[PDB]
Design a protein around this ligand. Structure first.
Ligand SMILES: [Mn+2]
Ligand SMILES: [Mn+2]
Lengths: 202, 202
């Protein structure tokens, strides 16, 4: 009963920053698999089908042991990819909303300093994982590195943006040149969507 | 002082099972990086510069905390890739030497049962990792799954063979179709090399 949403844009809409073939496989193979695996697990325990993926992630320890790992990885995967697609947009004029821009400046010193810290954390991921910008219960911002499809919901924070550092996110166009992928990704980040998330925390 | 070993074969020698471009990048970029990073980690510790990769892995808990993780990952990476190249060869008629064949049959029931259990473990890796055939001190065999560049040396076992399940190992030719890469990899496995290692355990 969870469904894979259509992308908010065509599979070739993030060219040349992300290649169409990748965006299509990433969505229709990798993300689809997380949804299908999550659904298979939840079909065994159908009262969980009524939970949001966020509720599942935040209550892993309460789920049946049989499916706990499958749910961590696949709800985590579903959540994380959903956010990734929704914070990207066909390459658009740089405009960082005031509230978010000011908070980044206050926290990291400048926008450039934030981008540098974030880029460096992403370049330093070992194996498969993610780098996030997250806000804690009091809206303080941090950069978080995670493994697998783990995400900041698990540590009680609100993810605002994340970059996928799994090799499938970049290998077809960039191969081992992960820094090139990271640098290019900034061109499709939708600051307005990141701002919407931050703003909602009120 | 740690050096990248040459491949025992041409970059196109495992075609069509492993693509030349992959073998070239996998070796000259990924494996090279593990060597360069291990060397960089050891630069400040001339006493450690004399240790084998194997000695480093077997002693990680005794290494300086400053470098421990980097040594685990990069010594592990150097060890793991060295073994991977050396247990592959241009595809030839499958001949499994008697001693190893017999041990596989005694342990798993049949060669095909072993190949099934091994392939299943490889298909089930979440994120970046390896699957190994390993022997204990008594030449008892087991299949081991690891994360990152971890390897059976770390649990006091002798790795005989391992398949790289990091996405960089297969994404250019197979993309998300990891099972296709796994199935194909059997065609380039050098059972003579695996048997050499097993035989050495005496
Ligand atoms: Mn992904
Ligand atoms: Mn590798």
């Amino acid at each position: 009963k969870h469904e894979l949403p259509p992308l908010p844009y065509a599979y070739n809409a993030l060219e040349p920053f992300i290649d169409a073939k990748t965006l299509e496989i990433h969505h229709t193979k990798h993300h689809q698999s997380y949804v299908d695996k999550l659904n298979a697990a939840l079909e065994k325990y159908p009262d969980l089908q009524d939970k949001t993926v966020e509720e599942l992630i935040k209550s892993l320890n309460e789920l049946p042991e049989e499916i706990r790992t499958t749910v961590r990885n696949n709800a985590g995967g579903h959540f994380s990819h959903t956010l990734y697609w929704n914070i990207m947009n066909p390459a658009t004029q740089e405009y960082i909303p005031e509230e978010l821009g000011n908070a980044l400046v206050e926290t990291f010193g400048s926008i450039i300093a934030f981008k540098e810290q974030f880029s460096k954390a992403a370049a330093n991921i070992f194996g498969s994982g993610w780098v996030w910008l997250a806000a804690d219960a009091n809206k303080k911002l941090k950069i978080v590195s995670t493994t697998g499809q783990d995400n900041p919901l698990m540590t009680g924070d609100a993810p605002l943006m994340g970059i996928d550092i799994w090799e499938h996110a970049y290998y077809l166009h960039y191969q081992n040149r992960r820094p090139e992928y990271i640098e290019n990704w900034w061109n499709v980040l939708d600051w307005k969507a990141v701002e919407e998330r931050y703003n909602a925390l009120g």
